[PDB]
Amino acid sequence: GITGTWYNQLGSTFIVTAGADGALTGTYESAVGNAESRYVLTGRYDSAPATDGSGTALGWTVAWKNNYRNAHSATTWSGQYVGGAEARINTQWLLTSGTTEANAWKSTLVGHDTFTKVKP
Amino acid sequence: GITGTWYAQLGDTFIVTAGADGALTGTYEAANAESRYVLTGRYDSAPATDGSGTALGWTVAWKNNYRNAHSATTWSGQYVGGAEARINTQWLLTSGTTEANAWKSTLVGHDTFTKVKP
Amino acid sequence: GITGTWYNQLGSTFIVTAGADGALTGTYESAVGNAESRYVLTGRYDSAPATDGSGTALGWTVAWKNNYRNAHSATTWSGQYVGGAEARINTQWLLTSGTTEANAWKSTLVGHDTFTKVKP
Amino acid sequence: GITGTWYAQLGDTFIVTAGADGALTGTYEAAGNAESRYVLTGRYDSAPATDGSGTALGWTVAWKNNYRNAHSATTWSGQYVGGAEARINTQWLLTSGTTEANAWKSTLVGHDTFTKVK
Numbered sequence: 001g002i003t004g005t006w007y008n009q010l011g012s013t014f015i016v017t018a019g020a021d022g023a024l025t026g027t028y029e030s031a032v033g034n035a036e037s038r039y040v041l042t043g044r045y046d047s048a049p050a051t052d053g054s055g056t057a058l059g060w061t062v063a064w065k066n067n068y069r070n071a072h073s074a075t076t077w078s079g080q081y082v083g084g085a086e087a088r089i090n091t092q093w094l095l096t097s098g099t100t101e102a103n104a105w106k107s108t109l110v111g112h113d114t115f116t117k118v119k120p
Numbered sequence: 121g122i123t124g125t126w127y128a129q130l131g132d133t134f135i136v137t138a139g140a141d142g143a144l145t146g147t148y149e150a151a152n153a154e155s156r157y158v159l160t161g162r163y164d165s166a167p168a169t170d171g172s173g174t175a176l177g178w179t180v181a182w183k184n185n186y187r188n189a190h191s192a193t194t195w196s197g198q199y200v201g202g203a204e205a206r207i208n209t210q211w212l213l214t215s216g217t218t219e220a221n222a223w224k225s226t227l228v229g230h231d232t233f234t235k236v237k238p
Numbered sequence: 239g240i241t242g243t244w245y246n247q248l249g250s251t252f253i254v255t256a257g258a259d260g261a262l263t264g265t266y267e268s269a270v271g272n273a274e275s276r277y278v279l280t281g282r283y284d285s286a287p288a289t290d291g292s293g294t295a296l297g298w299t300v301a302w303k304n305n306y307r308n309a310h311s312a313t314t315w316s317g318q319y320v321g322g323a324e325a326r327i328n329t330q331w332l333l334t335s336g337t338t339e340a341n342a343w344k345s346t347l348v349g350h351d352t353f354t355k356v357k358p
Numbered sequence: 359g360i361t362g363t364w365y366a367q368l369g370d371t372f373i374v375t376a377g378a379d380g381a382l383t384g385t386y387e388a389a390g391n392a393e394s395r396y397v398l399t400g401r402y403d404s405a406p407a408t409d410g411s412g413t414a415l416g417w418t419v420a421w422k423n424n425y426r427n428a429h430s431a432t433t434w435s436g437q438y439v440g441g442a443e444a445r446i447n448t449q450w451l452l453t454s455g456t457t458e459a460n461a462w463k464s465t466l467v468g469h470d471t472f473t474k475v476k
């Protein structure tokens with residue numbers, strides 16, 4: 001039930017396909033949705049989750065380069081998918097920017113996004 | 121110079137292919153086939169040319185043909201080239217949990233990789 | 239506006255006093271609030287925040303030892319206070335357990351708590 | 359063994375008193391001029407496990423003193439390991455006061471190891 005279009009609290013969108021082999025592929029974009037704001041995503045998920053009501057673990061990465069813009073950074077999301085009527089993906093993320101060695105200490109931001117299949 | 125074999129302080133190994141397009145693809149070895157896992161990620165395939173590192177990230181879901189930990193790790197970091205190339209990362213390891221345990225679902229840490237085995 | 243009794247989304251309670259010198263002192267407890275579940279906190283906050291509508295930075299620590307229990311761990315919350323008739327403290331936290339060197343890699347949990355002055 | 363002067367890899371220094379009760383109190387210096395010194399306060403486990411495990415601890419610095427105000431605070435969470443080469447291994451979170459619109463980028467994360475050796 002991971003496959004589909006998800007929306008987070010910031011208005012960002014990501015469309016993902018979950019493969020039988022554990023692959024996650026798709027696109028991550030802004031609320032705008034313009035070509036300039038769409039980025040490739042790739043990740044993995046647990047294709048054989050526990051049958052005890054636990055969430056499904058997964059992660060993905062977006063490097064913030066496309067054919068229009070380059071922010072010289074990449075975000076990874078790590079979290080879990082919870083299925084059902086109100087399916088959700090709860091994540092924490094790390095956004096690392098390319099930096100000089102001198103600035104490396106301030107290279108990585110941390111936050112949390114929750115995605116639903118519904119747009120507020 | 122990202123493509124190749126990388127070793128962490130713990131002795132984890134991963135071998136990765138960096139596609140011209142920004143793709144990272146390879147395997148992560150937790151130390152044997154039993155301990156080999158698929159990894160995929162992304163990197164900046166056009167980094168700044170000012171001495172800045174190259175941003176990247178990847179994910180491993182800890183399931184293979186032998187074991188399933190019902191968890192996934194993502195590493196976020198940057199590649200620094202040179203005579204002593206390195207990948208400096210921080211990571212998030214999320215386990216699949218019940219809702220009641222979701223507060224303790226995620227570990228955080230850091231890994232530095234080099235192309236030299238210790 | 240930081241001084242007072244706050245509740246997060248787990249039901250945990252923390253009572254804090256914010257001193258003029260930037261000190262945070264008080265107690266962190268469970269929803270029940272019995273003696274066995276109360277722990278000392280101490281932290282710091284920006285006693286002269288920006289006057290541009292920005293939050294107030296702060297942080298605090300609880301070591302999970304009191305005179306009843308000892309978890310051999312400590313949590314730090316890093317976040318900001320946002321004033322309002324609906325004031326809130328948005329935080330991320332790190333919970334580190336004492337470990338052997340072998341297990342140090344899995345010593346630290348990360349998460350996020352939001353506190354309000356109303357029970358959930 | 360926590361009480362003393364500690365040095366990070368970046369050359370930050372901090373001087374801390376560990377109270378019998380679990381209190382950490384002291385100062386954190388960036389550069390060691392007055393302009394660069396800040397108050398720290400935290401907590402540590404004053405009755406650690408006696409099984410080779412580290413001692414859990416954490417502390418906070420709000421980056422305001424009589425000279426500068428960065429409108430931010432860092433918390434370090436980690437553990438003390440004693441010995442001939444005592445160390446404090448930490449991860450940290452640095453949160454800046456921000457507008458709501460920028461709150462998503464309010465927090466940096468990283469890691470610091472401290473030793474009592476300059």
Ligand SMILES: O=C(CCCC[C@@H]1SC[C@@H]2NC(=O)N[C@@H]21)NNc1c(-c2ccc(S(=O)(=O)N3CCOCC3)cc2)cccc1-c1ccc(S(=O)(=O)N2CCOCC2)cc1
Pocket residue numbers: 008010012028029030031032036037038064069070071072073075093095111113462
């Ligand atoms: O790194 C970024 C933003 C990308 C990270 C979004 C994060 S990932 C986790 C969190 N969850 C989300 O969904 N969004 C956020 N900086 N912005 C630049 C971009 C860029 C702009 C828009 C988009 S988007 O597709 O419309 N979308 C926005 C909403 O979030 C999802 C993505 C994507 C990328 C491209 C090039 C450059 C930048 C950039 C970065 C920093 C600065 S700056 O403010 O630091 N600047 C002024 C100060 O001096 C230095 C330069 C300026 C431009």
Ligand SMILES: O=C(CCCC[C@@H]1SC[C@@H]2NC(=O)N[C@@H]21)NNc1c(-c2ccc(S(=O)(=O)N3CCOCC3)cc2)cccc1-c1ccc(S(=O)(=O)N2CCOCC2)cc1
Pocket residue numbers: 223246248250266267268269274275276302307308309310311313331333349351
């Ligand atoms: O240590 C904890 C959790 C304390 C941190 C709460 C976190 S701080 C961030 C987050 N925000 C919150 O408001 N609460 C959570 N509880 N358990 C205690 C233990 C203990 C810990 C682990 C295990 S175990 O994992 O099961 N283990 C044995 C079995 O094999 C696997 C390993 C066992 C025991 C030891 C001593 C004390 C505690 C404890 C319990 C409750 C509280 S509380 O009632 O004061 N309260 C819990 C929930 O709200 C926060 C405080 C505080 C400490």
